[PDB]
Design a protein around this ligand. Structure first.
Ligand code: ADE
Length: 284
């Protein structure tokens, strides 16, 4: 292949430090895409080529309903273009802020979608490393579409790699092992999941401060509290995820993976099959 003139560009969906995402319609098919556009001069000058390459390589591996899809890539002299699925309802974070928190049914449903997504991702040997509500988009049907793969890692199957050495993430969601051991693992995403479940119920993530270093100090000490009213089985689940030892988090490989996590009592009423076809509960 496609070229820019094959599309009609509409509204700007997002502006980042080195990318712009624009809604577009492909003329020959009438399909809508979110097109992420990178200016080559800028990505070269600012040493972002590895992250752009990583995003393309990781997204090309993914095929599951709970991820943003990469349908095509093309470039011209100035720019690289990634054709992505359009998530019309934007970031999960927007809904947390607006409603303040989610009821139990909605927490359960969205948590189950995230767990299903992570099961798929980790089953492919990929760590996200920057899981957070801003990176969990919502499609027109209000199912999740996880994005932001330029800081993800494909663990090498040939070496049975478990640990990744790049320092990436977001302070509120970063795992203690990355801070203290300088590496992340698949279980690092389970720590982020714990933060996210907490945030859905309480309205804010559990380790928070106006300076990143203050957050790091709390993470490494497991310094957080629950508000007095927090759904008890969700509290139990969070306490099984926000564990300093990454080999002791429910869902991790050392604990036999996603079957035991899906078996947690908080999920007793979830039907895991065809979750992407179930009608999400309305957010109120
Ligand atoms: N795929 C997408 N859909 C909607 N907004 C986005 N912002 C970044 N990627 C997006």
């Amino acid at each position: 292949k496609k070229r820019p003139e094959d599309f009609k560009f509409g509204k700007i969906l997002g502006e980042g430090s080195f990318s712009t995402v624009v809604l577009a319609r492909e003329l020959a098919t009438s399909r809508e895409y979110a097109i992420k556009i990178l200016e080559k001069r800028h990505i070269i000058k600012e040493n972002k080529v590895p992250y752009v390459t990583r995003e393309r390589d990781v997204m090309s591996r993914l095929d599951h309903p709970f991820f943003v899809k990469l349908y095509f890539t093309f470039q011209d002299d100035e720019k690289l273009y990634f054709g992505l699925s359009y998530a019309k309802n934007g970031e999960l974070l927007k809904y947390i802020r607006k409603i303040g928190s989610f009821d139990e049914t909605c927490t359960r449903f969205y948590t189950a979608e995230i767990v299903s997504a992570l099961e798929y991702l980790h089953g492919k040997g990929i760590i996200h490393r920057d899981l957070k509500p801003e990176n969990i988009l919502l499609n027109e049907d209000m199912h999740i579409q996880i994005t932001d793969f330029g800081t993800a890692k494909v663990l090498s199957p040939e070496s049975k790699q478990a640990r990744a050495n790049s320092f990436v993430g977001t302070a509120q969601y970063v795992s203690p092992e990355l801070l203290t051991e300088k590496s992340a693992c698949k279980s690092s995403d389970l720590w982020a999941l714990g933060c996210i479940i907490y945030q859905l119920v309480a309205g804010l993530p559990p380790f928070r401060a106006g300076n990143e270093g203050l957050i790091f100090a709390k993470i490494i000490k497991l310094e957080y509290d629950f508000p007095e009213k927090f759904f008890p089985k969700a509290r139990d689940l969070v306490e099984k995820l926000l564990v300093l030892d990454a080999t002791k988090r429910l869902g991790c490989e050392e604990m036999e993976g996603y079957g035991p996590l899906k078996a947690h009592p908080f999920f007793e009423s979830v039907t895991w099959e065809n979750l992407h076809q179930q009608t999400p509960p309305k957010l109120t």
